[model samples]
Target: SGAIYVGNYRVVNRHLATHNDWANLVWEDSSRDLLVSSTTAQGCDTIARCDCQTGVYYCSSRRKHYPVSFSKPSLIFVEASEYYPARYQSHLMLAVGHSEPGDCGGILRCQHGVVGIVSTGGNGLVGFADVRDLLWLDEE
Candidate 1:
């Protein structure tokens, strides 16, 4: 992920049956500072190369597909937002982008890992939030 803005999200819509309610709109800066350094990363394919406060992070192609069931994968510096519940909630809002029609779908969920909606591929903005608090990061 070279200069790629790999972001984060909090799932909403806890009463649905899919992971389509995930929403990530607001632009939250990273939770750490960045500086040039030489350290071995947790992954054999990448290295720890950024200080989160500055929000500049990097990764090699060798470390792409990471597991979702782990806590703190690689160098994750998330911006503090009121989106995700601070308690025991696992809400997620996923963006359903498609390289082709009917090929993309999204899953929305509320806190506690409940799936809310499963959206099909299309061309527009989708929103799911904690009390509709989602703000398009693109608009930021």
Candidate 2:
């Protein structure tokens, strides 16, 4: 166990949370197509999506660790958020932010909260997956 690994993580809980607008939304009861998480609904109303907390990579500034904290993108006004996850961009959960490579396992930062995490590109944009409950999330 070294810097090579992010940190010590454990599974707190696991649920169905199936990927369905109705099924998953009710199961999770939250919007996370952008791979982010947030608490402030006000901030999520707009783009920016405001200002997400920053994280200075693992060892270098170029680590693409951009956001230390998480955010939730706006699913209300931002049509792209839903549009991307529908047809051709189904894999791209949130097409509203700037993401870099190697962002997988990282939280998709939003304004109100975090959308989720990068499940495919690992860039925190596409491959949206809910990390607020499952996977390797530790109290780091």
lDDT of each: 0.22, 0.31
lDDT of 1 at 90: 24
Which candidate gets the maximum lDDT versus the true structure?
2
lDDT tens digits, residues 64-133, model 2?
Answer: 4443442332332223331233223221234323443344344444444443444333233334443434
Which stretches of candidate 1 lie above 4 Å from their native place?
5-31, 34-64, 72-136
- In angstroms, give how far residue 134 of model 2 lies from its true place: 10
How many angstroms is residue 67 displaced in model 2 relative to the true structure, after the best TM-score fit?
9.4
Instruction: Give me the displacement of residue 135 in model 1, in angstroms.
Output: 4.2
Shift of residue 117 alpha carbon in model 2, Å: 0.9
Lowest summed-lDDT stretch of 10 residues in model 2? Answer: 1-10
